[PDB]
Amino acid sequence: RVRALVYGHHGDPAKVVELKNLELAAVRGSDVRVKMLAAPINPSDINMIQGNYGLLPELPAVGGNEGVAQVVAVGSNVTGLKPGDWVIPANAGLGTWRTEAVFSEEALIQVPSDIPLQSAATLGVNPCTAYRMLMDFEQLQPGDSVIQNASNSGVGQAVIQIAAALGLRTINVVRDRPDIQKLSDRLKSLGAEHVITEEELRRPEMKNFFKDMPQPRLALNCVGGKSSTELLRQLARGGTMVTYGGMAKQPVVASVSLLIFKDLKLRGFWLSQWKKDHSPDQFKELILTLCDLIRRGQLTAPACSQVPLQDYQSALEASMKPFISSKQILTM
Amino acid sequence: RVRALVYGHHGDPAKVVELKNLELAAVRGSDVRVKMLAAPINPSDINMIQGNYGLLPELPAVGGNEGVAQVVAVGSNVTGLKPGDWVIPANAGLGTWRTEAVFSEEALIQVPSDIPLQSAATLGVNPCTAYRMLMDFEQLQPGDSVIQNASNSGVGQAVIQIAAALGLRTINVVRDRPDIQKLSDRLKSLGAEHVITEEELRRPEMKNFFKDMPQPRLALNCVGGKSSTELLRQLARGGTMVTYGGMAKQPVVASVSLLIFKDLKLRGFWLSQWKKDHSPDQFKELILTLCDLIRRGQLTAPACSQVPLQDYQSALEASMKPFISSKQILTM
C-alpha cells in the first residue's frame, strides 16, 4: 500500500505529523510514478510543518521537500524519463515523505544513479545552497577567503568542501559544545583552514588573528544576533554577508557605522527562489557540477542515519535537536 | 581678523568648540582665497567633532564641512576661478566654520551665482545625498514609490522635492510629536504623497495601507531600530533599504525571514565616499542637475535660522536637539 507522512494542521511536527495510507492516482499523460528511495528531514521541512516558512503547501500536506525517487513508470507522453531513472524534486513543496507518488514530469529532475544514494538523497538542498552562495554574491578567486558560522551544519560542511575544491580559504565559526576539539579535527579534514568558536571570535584577539590571511569579502550567516554581528565585523570594506538561516526571533543586527563607512552589504539566500527563477536545465547544470565533485571524491555526504518510514516520530524528534549528531534519512 | 570655530579635542561640540583667531596663509600658487558667506551645521559636523565619524580631520580642527563662499583672490596659476566667484567644497573635511580661509583650488567647486546664496549653502550635502540615494540603488521610473523615515530632516525634505521632480511617489515616515499635523501639511506641500507617523506604521493596518499604490523597491533609513525594521516590512520583494545615518547605539535590525523569503537588500550610503570615488566633473554634473531643479523652483531651500558666527554655541546647542525646528546656519 501507499504510506505517507501528512499534516492537516500547522504545528510542532511530532504532534502534527501522522502516518497515513493514500490511493495512488493515474499516470495520465505527462505524469510520472515514483518509488521514494530516501528522504532526509531538514529544517525547512520542520518550519513548513510549523507554519513559519516562505512557501506553505496547502493542508493537509505531505511532509518533506528533498529526496531521491526511482521511476517506476511514465505517462503516455514522457520523453526524458525511463523507468529505473533516479529523480529529485525540481522545486520545494513536493512532499517526499511517502513510499510512492505520481508526479508531473516537470516537478522532477533526473540525477545520475552512479553516485551514492545517500549523496543523491541530500544533493538538492545543502550542497546547492552552499554552491550558489559561493557563486552568486561575491566573485571569489583562489586564495580569497570566506567566513561562515554554523560550520558543522549540512550547508557549512558542504561549503567547506566546495570552497576547498574551489581554492578558497574558509574560516569557520562553530557553536560552543562539550568537545569543540572533536569537531575541529573533523572539519579541518574536510578542507577547513580555520575553526574557531563563537567565543574566540568575540574576544579582542580577532582584530589581529585575521592578519596573515586575506580578509573575506563574503560572510555566510545562519545564526543571527551577536554571532551575525561578529561575522559582519570580520568583513572587508564592501563585503557581503548572506543570511540563509536562523531563528524568527534571532534577527540580524547591522551597525550603522559598518553599513556607512565600511559599505558592507547584507542579503539573503533562498534556494527555492533561485530554483523558481531559473530553468530546470540550469538546476540540471548545477547538479552536474556537484556530481563532478562527488565522482572525484571532493564532495561527500554527511553523517546519515537511515530510519524506516514506520519510525518517523523518533527521527522527527531527533531533528528538532540543535545538537543533532547525524542527518535523519527516511527510507521506505 | 580671521576668526574660526576650532576644536583641539574630540567631544561634545558645546564644550570642545571655541572661537579662535587664526593667521591666514599666502596665496602660494594653486591656492584660493575665500570669504565664507554661510555655513550650515550638519549632523556629520557634529559626529566629526564628537569623534564618531569615518573621516576625522586632525586636531586641532576647524568645524564644518559645508558652506558657500566668495573668491577674494587666486594663486599664480588658477585657471577656473576669478575673484567674486561663488564656491562650495568639493569634498568633506575642509573646515567651513570660519570667516576666511585659503583652500587649494581642487578642494573647491564653482556654483552658479544665479541660485540663491541660501540654497547654495546647503546644496553640496543634503540634496546631493538625496539625489544619489534615489539613483544609485534602484532604477526608479515615474510612478514608482519610495519610502523614507525622518522625512522632515534636511535629507528627507530634499528627497520629497527631488522624488517629486522625478515623478515618484513618496511615503514619508515622521517621528511622533506634539503636533504632527503641522508638519504633515508642510511636507505634503513640498510634494509628499503620504505623511505618516512612526506609530501609524507599526499598527496592523499597514499590510493593507500599501494596497492601492505600488510597493516601494526603495526604502531610505536614518533612524534604525524598530523604525528601520518597519521600513523593511514595507519593501517589495527584492527591494533595498539604504541607511544614511542614525545612532551609533541604534543599529539596523533585519528579520531573518525578510532577508530570505523577501530577498531584501541592506546598504549604506556615504556622500563623502561617492565624492572621492568619483571625478570632479561627475560632482559638477550632479551640481548642475540639482541647480536646474532650483532654477525651476522644484527644489527650494529648507527652513533655517541664520546666526552670526559670534553666537555659535547658541546654534550648536539648537542643533544637538532631536526636535530642532530649523537648520542652524552660521553667517560671517
XYZ file of C-alpha atoms in Angstrom:
664
model
C 0.000 0.000 0.000
C 0.931 3.699 -0.270
C 2.052 5.231 3.016
C 2.622 8.949 3.508
C 3.586 11.345 6.293
C 0.898 14.036 6.318
C -0.050 17.039 8.438
C -3.541 18.566 8.376
C -2.711 21.376 10.806
C 0.373 23.574 11.226
C 2.305 22.879 14.454
C 5.099 21.040 16.267
C 5.858 18.179 13.763
C 5.946 15.400 16.390
C 2.312 16.316 17.088
C 1.105 17.367 13.637
C 2.726 14.655 11.523
C 0.912 11.352 11.298
C 1.313 8.240 9.107
C -1.469 7.683 6.588
C -2.334 5.430 3.663
C -3.153 7.015 0.318
C -4.531 5.801 -3.016
C -2.268 6.468 -5.993
C -3.557 8.481 -8.935
C -3.350 7.542 -12.586
C -0.345 8.128 -14.835
C -2.482 10.428 -17.012
C -0.105 11.605 -19.757
C 2.644 13.905 -18.511
C 2.577 12.243 -15.100
C 5.375 10.138 -13.608
C 5.144 7.350 -10.994
C 7.940 7.101 -8.459
C 9.144 4.883 -5.628
C 10.782 7.034 -2.943
C 14.238 5.771 -2.068
C 15.341 8.129 0.685
C 14.083 11.394 2.122
C 16.043 13.495 4.529
C 14.478 15.533 7.317
C 15.665 19.149 7.080
C 14.962 22.384 8.986
C 12.981 23.848 6.088
C 10.779 20.764 6.339
C 10.217 21.443 10.039
C 9.490 25.145 9.509
C 6.987 24.295 6.844
C 5.194 21.900 9.161
C 5.306 24.599 11.832
C 3.795 27.238 9.529
C 6.846 29.531 9.610
C 8.185 29.426 6.031
C 8.113 31.335 2.725
C 6.279 28.507 0.968
C 3.449 26.607 2.652
C 1.798 23.657 0.865
C -1.951 23.573 1.426
C -3.163 21.439 4.320
C -3.270 18.564 4.574
C 0.212 18.341 3.069
C 2.775 15.566 2.769
C 5.941 16.400 4.678
C 9.343 16.800 3.041
C 10.898 18.729 0.193
C 14.059 16.783 -0.538
C 14.740 13.141 -1.574
C 15.559 10.538 -4.269
C 12.945 8.528 -6.071
C 13.262 5.823 -8.723
C 10.967 5.977 -11.734
C 8.580 3.030 -11.908
C 6.547 4.157 -14.922
C 5.842 7.106 -17.231
C 2.796 8.804 -18.747
C 1.712 8.339 -22.373
C 3.943 11.240 -23.397
C 7.073 11.296 -21.217
C 10.291 11.923 -23.103
C 13.136 12.437 -20.654
C 12.481 9.692 -18.144
C 12.514 5.925 -18.441
C 11.824 3.573 -15.541
C 14.886 2.935 -13.377
C 15.872 6.569 -13.571
C 16.710 8.443 -10.351
C 14.780 11.649 -9.688
C 14.779 14.543 -7.198
C 12.246 17.414 -6.932
C 12.607 20.395 -9.272
C 11.455 22.755 -6.540
C 10.386 22.736 -2.890
C 6.852 21.810 -1.847
C 6.628 18.340 -3.377
C 6.112 16.123 -0.303
C 8.840 13.499 -0.257
C 7.885 11.687 2.942
C 5.913 8.906 1.299
C 6.601 5.440 -0.153
C 5.329 6.202 -3.653
C 3.854 9.004 -5.743
C 2.664 10.107 -9.174
C 4.233 13.424 -10.067
C 4.079 15.715 -13.080
C 7.284 15.189 -15.038
C 8.203 18.872 -14.739
C 8.189 18.764 -10.957
C 11.067 16.291 -11.275
C 14.682 16.331 -12.467
C 16.858 13.287 -13.224
C 20.105 12.747 -11.286
C 22.859 10.313 -12.098
C 22.471 6.929 -10.373
C 26.211 6.265 -10.327
C 26.545 8.299 -7.119
C 25.958 7.147 -3.565
C 22.226 7.009 -2.812
C 22.937 8.994 0.360
C 24.518 11.719 -1.723
C 21.653 11.830 -4.219
C 19.121 11.986 -1.394
C 20.862 15.071 0.054
C 22.211 16.770 -3.076
C 19.250 19.027 -3.999
C 19.435 21.214 -0.915
C 22.525 21.737 1.216
C 25.219 21.424 -1.464
C 23.197 23.562 -3.907
C 22.716 26.295 -1.301
C 26.402 26.148 -0.398
C 27.431 26.356 -4.056
C 25.039 29.165 -5.042
C 26.072 31.287 -2.027
C 29.715 30.955 -3.028
C 28.894 31.957 -6.625
C 26.021 34.472 -6.688
C 27.252 37.150 -4.278
C 30.927 37.890 -4.442
C 33.323 36.892 -7.191
C 35.802 34.726 -5.347
C 39.186 33.728 -6.710
C 41.524 31.056 -5.403
C 43.257 32.465 -2.345
C 40.197 34.530 -1.443
C 38.616 33.758 1.916
C 35.085 33.115 3.159
C 33.898 33.306 6.751
C 30.889 31.368 7.936
C 29.000 30.384 11.053
C 27.217 27.096 11.880
C 30.111 25.447 10.090
C 29.022 21.988 11.235
C 25.628 22.256 9.562
C 24.792 20.373 6.388
C 25.351 23.606 4.491
C 28.521 24.684 6.301
C 30.063 21.284 5.834
C 29.243 21.417 2.097
C 30.588 24.967 1.908
C 33.840 23.720 3.419
C 34.322 21.021 0.755
C 33.148 23.126 -2.205
C 35.208 26.077 -1.019
C 38.269 23.813 -0.659
C 37.702 22.257 -4.090
C 37.477 25.865 -5.271
C 40.859 27.008 -3.968
C 39.311 29.154 -1.261
C 40.171 29.678 2.412
C 37.382 29.188 4.916
C 37.322 30.485 8.446
C 34.536 28.619 10.154
C 32.689 29.527 13.330
C 31.229 26.610 15.271
C 28.945 26.725 18.312
C 30.399 26.054 21.755
C 29.989 22.378 22.566
C 31.309 19.916 25.186
C 34.139 18.838 22.915
C 34.736 21.598 20.355
C 38.079 19.857 19.836
C 36.496 16.742 18.302
C 34.651 18.890 15.746
C 37.732 20.934 14.833
C 39.722 17.974 13.540
C 36.651 16.730 11.679
C 36.044 19.874 9.592
C 39.746 20.526 9.224
C 39.931 17.159 7.411
C 37.055 18.391 5.278
C 39.279 21.166 3.941
C 38.548 23.803 6.570
C 41.509 26.128 7.126
C 40.359 27.659 10.409
C 37.885 26.503 13.025
C 37.020 28.990 15.743
C 34.424 29.303 18.470
C 31.642 31.794 18.682
C 33.803 32.794 21.658
C 37.283 33.043 20.105
C 35.687 35.441 17.608
C 34.022 37.846 20.075
C 37.245 38.276 22.061
C 39.581 41.217 21.417
C 42.051 38.878 19.679
C 40.263 38.798 16.337
C 41.243 42.222 15.039
C 44.613 40.503 14.647
C 44.069 36.752 14.186
C 42.763 37.787 10.787
C 46.051 39.457 9.862
C 48.147 36.944 7.936
C 45.439 35.772 5.543
C 43.229 37.986 3.323
C 40.015 39.332 4.836
C 36.812 37.725 3.474
C 34.507 39.596 1.095
C 31.794 37.022 1.815
C 30.224 36.053 5.113
C 27.713 33.226 5.432
C 25.183 33.581 8.238
C 22.612 31.156 9.624
C 22.613 32.136 13.303
C 21.895 35.832 13.665
C 22.136 38.032 16.735
C 25.601 38.565 18.160
C 27.098 35.741 16.136
C 25.891 37.592 12.985
C 27.168 40.941 14.291
C 30.647 39.430 14.717
C 30.626 37.987 11.194
C 29.894 41.496 9.885
C 32.920 42.730 11.852
C 35.283 40.376 10.024
C 34.248 41.606 6.599
C 36.469 43.731 4.372
C 35.256 47.115 3.074
C 32.377 46.381 0.676
C 31.909 42.708 1.582
C 28.588 40.880 1.637
C 27.056 38.885 4.462
C 24.453 36.488 3.084
C 21.935 35.154 5.632
C 20.423 31.825 4.671
C 19.031 30.687 8.003
C 18.389 31.413 11.667
C 15.582 31.948 14.149
C 12.416 34.003 13.609
C 13.257 35.657 16.956
C 17.021 35.974 16.329
C 17.187 38.856 13.736
C 20.324 40.131 12.023
C 21.842 43.250 13.533
C 23.834 45.722 11.429
C 25.965 48.505 12.904
C 25.075 51.868 11.339
C 28.822 52.500 11.107
C 29.503 49.214 9.298
C 26.855 49.941 6.649
C 28.067 53.511 6.014
C 31.866 53.665 6.431
C 32.675 50.029 5.583
C 29.986 49.855 2.895
C 29.050 46.304 3.867
C 26.058 44.649 2.276
C 23.526 42.291 3.802
C 21.491 39.905 1.694
C 19.510 36.717 1.932
C 19.556 33.435 0.089
C 16.574 31.200 -0.675
C 17.236 28.089 -2.766
C 13.569 27.763 -3.658
C 13.607 31.250 -5.097
C 16.644 30.529 -7.264
C 15.089 27.272 -8.464
C 11.876 29.044 -9.398
C 13.736 31.947 -11.030
C 15.787 29.606 -13.174
C 15.260 26.966 -15.794
C 15.156 23.217 -14.962
C 18.236 22.864 -17.152
C 20.039 25.492 -15.095
C 19.286 23.463 -11.954
C 20.462 20.483 -14.004
C 23.937 22.001 -14.702
C 24.329 22.838 -11.009
C 23.627 19.176 -10.249
C 26.108 18.077 -12.928
C 28.668 20.416 -11.393
C 28.019 18.860 -7.948
C 28.161 15.295 -9.244
C 31.556 16.157 -10.721
C 32.996 16.975 -7.293
C 31.415 13.807 -5.921
C 32.905 11.463 -8.548
C 36.340 12.956 -7.825
C 35.832 12.466 -4.075
C 35.813 16.208 -3.353
C 32.247 16.316 -2.055
C 30.906 13.686 0.308
C 27.549 13.141 2.001
C 27.453 13.805 5.743
C 26.649 11.513 8.687
C 23.495 9.598 7.703
C 21.038 7.720 9.884
C 18.527 5.715 7.842
C 15.146 5.395 9.524
C 12.213 3.359 8.192
C 9.038 5.400 7.486
C 7.494 3.356 10.310
C 9.520 5.181 12.997
C 9.305 8.769 11.789
C 8.444 10.215 15.199
C 11.811 9.229 16.637
C 13.558 10.636 13.565
C 11.392 13.754 13.697
C 12.310 14.294 17.348
C 15.989 13.716 16.672
C 15.915 16.512 14.062
C 14.291 19.012 16.386
C 17.546 18.815 18.352
C 20.045 21.698 17.920
C 22.913 19.281 18.502
C 21.649 16.526 16.191
C 24.665 14.293 15.521
C 23.619 12.856 12.140
C 21.120 13.630 9.342
C 17.892 11.685 9.728
C 17.072 9.918 6.440
C 13.659 8.358 5.954
C 13.742 5.178 3.890
C 10.857 3.118 2.542
C 40.845 89.319 11.821
C 40.472 85.710 10.680
C 38.016 84.016 13.033
C 37.440 80.257 13.260
C 35.492 77.677 15.246
C 38.101 75.084 16.203
C 38.293 72.025 18.418
C 41.507 70.659 19.918
C 39.933 67.587 21.480
C 37.049 65.398 20.330
C 33.817 65.626 22.325
C 30.537 67.484 22.884
C 30.625 70.469 20.431
C 29.132 72.862 23.017
C 32.299 72.135 25.028
C 35.131 71.366 22.569
C 34.392 74.110 20.056
C 35.738 77.557 20.848
C 36.246 80.712 18.776
C 39.879 81.153 17.736
C 41.755 83.829 15.800
C 43.957 82.469 13.033
C 46.691 83.668 10.698
C 45.786 83.380 7.012
C 48.284 81.721 4.652
C 49.744 83.004 1.392
C 48.055 82.528 -1.965
C 51.001 80.329 -2.936
C 50.316 79.129 -6.483
C 47.203 76.978 -6.819
C 45.741 78.247 -3.552
C 42.434 80.150 -3.486
C 41.262 82.811 -1.041
C 37.652 82.991 0.096
C 35.362 84.875 2.457
C 32.864 82.476 3.989
C 29.325 83.565 3.165
C 27.282 80.994 5.178
C 27.938 77.533 6.634
C 25.210 75.150 7.767
C 25.552 72.980 10.845
C 25.072 69.334 9.798
C 24.923 66.006 11.746
C 28.126 64.941 10.056
C 29.757 68.082 11.507
C 28.574 67.041 14.990
C 29.718 63.432 14.612
C 33.034 64.824 13.408
C 33.620 66.996 16.477
C 32.315 64.196 18.733
C 34.764 61.677 17.230
C 32.271 59.159 15.832
C 32.868 59.591 12.102
C 34.528 57.732 9.186
C 36.718 60.695 8.333
C 38.137 62.782 11.156
C 40.291 65.859 10.483
C 43.374 66.092 12.670
C 43.048 68.146 15.822
C 43.075 70.937 16.289
C 40.497 71.138 13.535
C 38.128 73.758 12.220
C 34.489 72.665 12.416
C 32.218 72.414 9.376
C 32.097 70.576 6.068
C 29.563 72.572 4.097
C 29.079 76.233 3.120
C 29.155 78.919 0.411
C 31.993 81.304 -0.164
C 33.096 84.038 -2.494
C 36.577 84.094 -4.081
C 38.610 87.106 -2.955
C 41.881 86.326 -4.737
C 43.590 83.483 -6.616
C 47.072 81.975 -6.814
C 49.692 82.466 -9.542
C 48.232 79.599 -11.618
C 44.481 79.397 -11.025
C 42.550 78.605 -14.209
C 38.849 78.243 -13.357
C 38.109 80.706 -10.584
C 38.133 84.500 -10.755
C 37.508 86.624 -7.675
C 33.831 87.287 -6.944
C 33.165 83.659 -7.859
C 30.893 81.592 -5.585
C 32.255 78.247 -4.399
C 31.351 75.317 -2.116
C 33.568 72.410 -1.001
C 34.481 69.608 -3.433
C 34.706 67.051 -0.606
C 34.174 66.986 3.152
C 36.863 67.804 5.732
C 37.649 71.361 4.622
C 36.631 73.292 7.762
C 33.956 75.827 6.797
C 33.179 77.394 10.172
C 35.436 80.431 9.850
C 35.306 83.934 8.365
C 38.135 83.472 5.918
C 40.436 80.798 4.571
C 42.792 79.777 1.790
C 41.943 76.482 0.118
C 43.611 74.647 -2.710
C 41.666 75.141 -5.920
C 40.820 71.438 -6.228
C 39.147 71.375 -2.811
C 36.562 73.815 -4.232
C 33.871 73.872 -6.928
C 32.179 76.838 -8.529
C 28.460 77.228 -8.021
C 26.382 79.270 -10.401
C 25.821 82.712 -8.864
C 22.235 82.797 -10.154
C 20.936 80.471 -7.435
C 20.097 81.770 -4.056
C 23.019 82.004 -1.632
C 20.691 80.324 0.880
C 20.238 77.384 -1.482
C 23.918 77.306 -2.413
C 24.958 76.955 1.237
C 23.033 73.658 1.682
C 23.484 72.289 -1.843
C 26.738 70.333 -1.515
C 25.406 67.952 1.109
C 21.758 67.029 1.756
C 20.364 67.489 -1.767
C 23.352 65.512 -3.098
C 22.755 62.675 -0.613
C 19.057 62.555 -1.564
C 19.593 62.581 -5.334
C 22.300 59.886 -5.085
C 20.187 57.566 -2.964
C 17.352 57.921 -5.484
C 19.736 56.947 -8.291
C 22.472 54.573 -7.081
C 20.417 51.704 -5.626
C 17.184 51.097 -7.531
C 16.252 52.221 -11.010
C 13.141 54.277 -10.377
C 10.681 55.290 -13.076
C 7.877 57.837 -12.944
C 5.086 56.265 -10.894
C 7.393 54.193 -8.685
C 7.090 54.597 -4.916
C 9.730 55.314 -2.283
C 9.643 55.173 1.471
C 11.762 57.026 3.984
C 11.892 57.920 7.661
C 12.918 61.240 9.239
C 11.114 62.849 6.299
C 11.287 66.244 7.979
C 15.088 66.213 8.091
C 17.256 68.066 5.571
C 17.766 64.917 3.537
C 14.152 63.764 3.807
C 12.880 67.131 2.729
C 15.238 67.118 -0.281
C 14.023 63.579 -1.062
C 10.434 64.773 -1.211
C 11.215 67.516 -3.688
C 13.622 65.532 -5.857
C 11.398 62.476 -5.825
C 8.530 64.800 -6.846
C 10.510 66.404 -9.668
C 11.284 62.789 -10.599
C 7.607 61.823 -10.850
C 7.853 59.363 -7.987
C 5.505 58.662 -5.079
C 6.836 59.107 -1.552
C 5.520 57.623 1.656
C 7.174 59.619 4.422
C 7.554 58.472 7.998
C 7.880 61.251 10.581
C 8.667 60.868 14.278
C 5.823 61.353 16.731
C 5.490 64.929 18.020
C 3.003 67.233 19.859
C 1.576 68.487 16.549
C 2.468 66.038 13.793
C -0.406 67.749 11.977
C 1.535 70.952 11.252
C 4.473 69.028 9.851
C 2.312 66.887 7.590
C 0.748 69.830 5.746
C 4.232 71.282 5.238
C 5.745 68.203 3.609
C 2.551 67.499 1.677
C 3.050 70.908 0.033
C 6.649 70.024 -0.779
C 5.265 67.081 -2.773
C 4.966 64.296 -0.229
C 2.119 61.973 -1.307
C 1.677 60.488 2.143
C 2.952 61.566 5.550
C 2.754 59.003 8.301
C 3.905 58.547 11.871
C 6.204 56.011 13.388
C 3.107 54.964 15.322
C 0.690 54.672 12.378
C 3.258 52.484 10.600
C 3.646 49.859 13.336
C -0.082 49.156 13.720
C -1.584 46.215 11.884
C -3.219 48.386 9.242
C -0.077 48.575 7.117
C -0.233 45.228 5.382
C -3.116 46.913 3.572
C -2.450 50.667 3.580
C 0.062 49.751 0.888
C -2.518 48.055 -1.329
C -3.748 50.677 -3.749
C -0.407 52.155 -4.805
C 2.679 50.072 -5.737
C 5.090 48.801 -3.084
C 8.433 50.597 -2.964
C 11.639 48.891 -4.138
C 13.479 51.599 -2.219
C 13.480 52.491 1.483
C 15.576 55.334 2.950
C 16.701 54.889 6.562
C 18.091 57.370 9.024
C 16.696 56.148 12.368
C 17.314 52.414 12.778
C 15.830 50.103 15.436
C 12.144 49.166 15.173
C 11.521 52.070 12.757
C 14.121 50.611 10.374
C 12.514 47.172 10.704
C 9.080 48.604 9.898
C 10.514 50.375 6.826
C 11.974 46.995 5.952
C 8.482 45.470 6.190
C 7.081 47.856 3.562
C 9.532 46.864 0.805
C 8.537 44.858 -2.240
C 10.407 41.545 -2.796
C 13.960 42.366 -3.902
C 13.861 45.887 -2.528
C 16.759 47.763 -0.992
C 16.841 49.698 2.254
C 19.653 52.260 2.237
C 20.930 53.635 5.553
C 22.454 57.097 5.506
C 22.535 57.833 9.207
C 21.394 57.185 12.750
C 22.590 56.498 16.271
C 25.785 54.521 16.953
C 23.750 52.640 19.578
C 20.638 52.278 17.368
C 21.801 49.740 14.672
C 19.637 48.395 11.868
C 17.645 45.220 12.561
C 16.902 42.762 9.771
C 14.452 39.904 10.208
C 15.761 36.563 9.002
C 12.511 35.886 7.137
C 12.606 39.245 5.410
C 16.156 38.820 4.076
C 15.499 35.236 2.989
C 11.910 34.964 1.689
C 11.661 38.568 0.557
C 15.230 38.864 -0.782
C 15.629 42.317 0.708
C 18.939 44.184 0.428
C 20.527 46.430 3.060
C 23.117 49.028 2.072
C 24.783 52.186 3.306
C 25.441 55.454 1.571
C 28.234 57.862 2.367
C 28.316 61.017 0.244
C 31.958 61.663 1.160
C 32.921 58.294 -0.312
C 30.944 58.822 -3.503
C 32.682 62.165 -3.974
C 36.086 60.579 -3.519
C 35.278 57.578 -5.732
C 34.117 59.923 -8.464
C 35.573 62.712 -10.626
C 35.200 66.464 -10.071
C 33.327 66.558 -13.361
C 30.953 63.931 -12.069
C 30.401 66.072 -8.992
C 29.920 69.059 -11.293
C 27.266 67.183 -13.256
C 25.396 66.387 -10.050
C 25.613 70.045 -9.071
C 24.353 71.240 -12.446
C 21.457 68.775 -12.295
C 20.438 69.976 -8.822
C 20.863 73.661 -9.778
C 18.403 73.002 -12.595
C 15.670 71.878 -10.161
C 16.271 75.029 -8.176
C 16.184 77.293 -11.272
C 12.740 75.868 -11.999
C 11.572 76.203 -8.404
C 11.331 72.432 -7.951
C 13.923 72.395 -5.187
C 13.793 75.081 -2.537
C 15.952 75.813 0.460
C 14.722 74.431 3.762
C 13.775 76.463 6.810
C 16.773 77.862 8.610
C 17.885 80.177 11.366
C 20.831 82.376 10.390
C 23.237 83.170 13.188
C 26.349 85.322 13.244
C 29.488 83.207 13.826
C 29.638 85.128 17.117
C 26.818 83.179 18.755
C 27.879 79.700 17.664
C 27.189 77.929 20.969
C 23.570 79.054 20.589
C 23.368 77.403 17.155
C 25.422 74.423 18.342
C 23.003 73.929 21.214
C 19.982 74.226 18.953
C 21.272 71.519 16.610
C 22.087 68.819 19.171
C 18.355 68.820 19.871
C 16.241 65.968 18.356
C 13.327 68.281 17.652
C 15.306 71.230 16.232
C 12.834 73.410 14.317
C 15.151 74.817 11.641
C 18.564 74.159 10.132
C 21.072 76.286 12.062
C 23.086 78.375 9.569
C 26.237 80.302 10.542
C 26.905 83.658 8.860
C 30.162 85.615 8.625
